[PDB]
Amino acid sequence: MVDAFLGTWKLVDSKNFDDYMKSLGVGFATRQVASMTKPTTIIEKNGDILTLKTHSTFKNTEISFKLGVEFDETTADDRKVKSIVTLDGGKLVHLQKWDGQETTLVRELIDGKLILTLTHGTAVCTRTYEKEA
Template identity: 65%
Template structure:
């Protein structure tokens, strides 16, 4: 399986995350802590907020009563990404 290239750039208070893969390229630009509209790689229209917590970029995506949390952190010179998807308010996680 091919791994995407993830390019994170900072220009003042604007951060850009660009993902490049054979499947699809995506790019988001945001300010920490400010909600923004995002169209995901699978074409979902979500409201996202990204914060910095303990050296990790924590992204929360909300749409149609669902929530995904994506944590991105550098560990031993490698990017570790953990995603938590909350499907129902009753607490089903995968």
């Protein structure tokens, strides 16, 4: 089910990340560093617990969760949100809610690449990752 997402992924393309960050109210100086950062995402499992790590020269984050069970999350931009990750049509869908707002982080595998689509408001960012050996 989740197994083809597991591993180490490196950012190879990004579209509209600044628009997504702006929509969330991230400050200009943080957007500016983040626009030049190429993070590594690591996805691991131990039983039914998934861990997702995002490593970079700027910010590092790590979450652990069970699919389909809500968890509290503090995001890289310091939002305190209620999160849930599920599997929907073969995609890993991460929904964050806070203050009546929502954002989705959808991960799909196409041609061996991991495509992350981030939506908040009208902003839609697409980030492409390639799997490390």
